[PDB]
């Protein structure tokens, strides 16, 4: 009967409450997946537990020992029954598990430090004095690593042996080292986020032209699960109902400090 | 499995949603009450459909037919298996059904047009320019035909063959009534209510004096059910947790327009 959700701590899907530590399981946390899951839960009617991924990441695939890793790792392996978070949408993941229809939209997408003298990734590529990064062991990472496009190529080589590592284990860490860094160092992270961070304190940091592609987040369901058609349903109605939208000016506009 | 709960009506505890029409089920609703009702089922672990008292109102014993309305019928003849709402721990009540222990305080006051002259329930007695009600079918309606204390008695004799009538079937047509008056028209009612009109637009109400007497809203049972037992548990958890407190904030003052 308790279907466990897993699930990622990342900014604002899912956050510890302020005083976390007075409360117990699924109250402990507050976001927009939190959100998500819940009224899920409540349109295909189940109980729930959300479960926060041991080794924090979304998922990859390990190219030596074969095995999925993060959320993707959790649903494959049957320890999770459903991963509500910003997992984005891919083909290579799609092969491996059930996504519902995607229930936001995003894209990759440059962060700078305010000021910085970048428009471009052509204009990250073209040059060696600033840095950059992405989350490792996620979607971002895959994108470039798998990309034929000449520039994402030249950005690719260039992080691929970039010391020290460029490579973060966290969203945070990028953002850190981002505002750290005086200038030096851009961060391709999704434009969720991307613009979740801009409205954030101290306002030192922003999204600088196009995203390089537009893709979404999807709930995902082990493969074949009996519970993607429910899920999917909820989703579709969320949306005609207004309530994706609702949730997202909560999290990110309605919240916003800069 | 599903639980039906009883409830009314009644701002800030059980409201219609902005567009309610938009949802159906539990979340046409928002309010004081309706973040109770979850946050119990949460911690009794229950399903449990908010079902709004079809003649709306609390629950008082017919004197001729002997029979109970409101939610307090509702319980105990078997049609609601749980009160969620600004419900009364009366003596009257408590023999015929259960109550946890009170989830909110609150006592009975008298709430004016800004500007009327007065102050306390004897300056309400000595006069007869003024004209003054509560609540049909509630408890401070029979707190004042229960009374012996002189004021009260005068209080009551007076009402009780008013016309036209000064009971009102519901709580917005007291405060209606109070605000159409021109300072002709005061209104008993708890101080709960008084204070969330206090702070609502046009602010043109408030609360004079005192409380008459000090009492608080119960959730409540049919007799001896022996759901009782877990919901007492978890109001008591929710009051050390911090938790009743924060929803009347969140419902009274942090939404607070005067
Ligand atoms: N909350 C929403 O309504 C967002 O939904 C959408 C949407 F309506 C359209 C798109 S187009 C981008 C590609 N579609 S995808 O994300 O399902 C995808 C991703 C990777 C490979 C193939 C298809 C995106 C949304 F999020
Ligand atoms: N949210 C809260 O903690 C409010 O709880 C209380 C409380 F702690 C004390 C009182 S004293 C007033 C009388 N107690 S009663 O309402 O249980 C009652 C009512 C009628 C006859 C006998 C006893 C009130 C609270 F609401
Ligand atoms: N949403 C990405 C993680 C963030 C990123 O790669 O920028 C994923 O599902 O892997
Ligand atoms: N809370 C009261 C209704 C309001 C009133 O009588 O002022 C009751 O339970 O009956
Ligand atoms: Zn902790
Ligand atoms: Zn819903
Ligand atoms: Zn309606
Ligand atoms: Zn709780």
Same mark, same amino acid.
């Given at each position: 009967?308790?279907?466990?959700?897993?699930?990622?701590?990342?900014?604002?899907?899912?956050?510890?409450?302020?005083?976390?530590?007075?409360?117990?399981?699924?109250?402990?946390?507050?976001?927009?997946?939190?959100?998500?899951?819940?009224?899920?839960?409540?349109?295909?009617?189940?109980?729930?537990?959300?479960?926060?991924?041991?080794?924090?990441?979304?998922?990859?695939?390990?190219?030596?020992?074969?095995?999925?890793?993060?959320?993707?790792?959790?649903?494959?392996?049957?320890?999770?029954?459903?991963?509500?978070?910003?997992?984005?949408?891919?083909?290579?993941?799609?092969?491996?598990?059930?996504?519902?229809?995607?229930?936001?939209?995003?894209?990759?997408?440059?962060?700078?430090? $305010? /000021?910085?003298?970048?428009?471009? &990734?052509?204009? #990250? =590529?073209?040059?060696?004095?600033?840095?950059? +990064?992405? *989350? @490792?062991?996620?979607?971002?990472?895959?994108?470039?690593?798998?990309?034929?496009?000449?520039?994402?190529?030249?950005?690719?080589?260039?992080?691929?042996?970039?010391?020290?590592?460029?490579?973060?284990?966290?969203?945070?860490?990028?953002?850190?080292?981002?505002?750290?860094?005086?200038?030096?160092?851009?961060?391709?992270?999704?434009?969720?986020?991307?613009?979740?961070?801009?409205?954030?304190?101290?306002?030192?940091?922003?999204?600088?032209?196009?995203?390089?592609?537009?893709?979404?987040?999807?709930?995902?369901?082990? $493969? /074949?699960?009996?519970?993607?058609? &429910?899920?999917? #349903? =909820?989703?579709?109605?969320?949306?005609?109902? +207004?309530? *994706? @939208?609702?949730?997202?000016?909560?999290?990110?506009?309605?919240?916003?400090?800069?």
């Amino acid at each position: 009967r308790t279907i466990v959700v897993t699930t990622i701590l990342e900014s604002p899907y899912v956050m510890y409450k302020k005083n976390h530590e007075q409360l117990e399981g699924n109250e402990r946390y507050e976001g927009y997946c939190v959100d998500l899951a819940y009224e899920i839960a409540k349109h295909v009617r189940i109980k729930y537990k959300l479960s926060i991924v041991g080794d924090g990441k979304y998922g990859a695939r390990d190219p030596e020992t074969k095995i999925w890793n993060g959320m993707v790792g959790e649903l494959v392996y049957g320890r999770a029954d459903i991963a509500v978070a910003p997992l984005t949408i891919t083909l290579v993941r799609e092969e491996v598990i059930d996504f519902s229809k995607p229930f936001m939209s995003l894209g990759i997408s440059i962060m700078i430090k $305010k /000021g910085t003298p970048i428009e471009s &990734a052509e204009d #990250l =590529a073209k040059q060696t004095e600033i840095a950059y +990064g992405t *989350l @490792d062991s996620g979607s971002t990472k895959e994108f470039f690593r798998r990309s034929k496009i000449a520039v994402y190529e030249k950005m690719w080589s260039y992080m691929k042996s970039a010391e020290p590592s460029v490579f973060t284990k966290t969203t945070a860490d990028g953002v850190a080292r981002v505002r750290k860094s005086k200038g030096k160092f851009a961060f391709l992270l999704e434009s969720t986020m991307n613009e979740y961070i801009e409205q954030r304190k101290p306002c030192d940091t922003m999204k600088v032209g196009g995203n390089l592609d537009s893709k979404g987040y999807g709930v995902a369901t082990p $493969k /074949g699960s009996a519970l993607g058609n &429910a899920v999917n #349903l =909820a989703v579709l109605k969320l949306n005609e109902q +207004g309530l *994706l @939208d609702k949730l997202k000016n909560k999290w990110w506009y309605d919240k916003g400090e800069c």
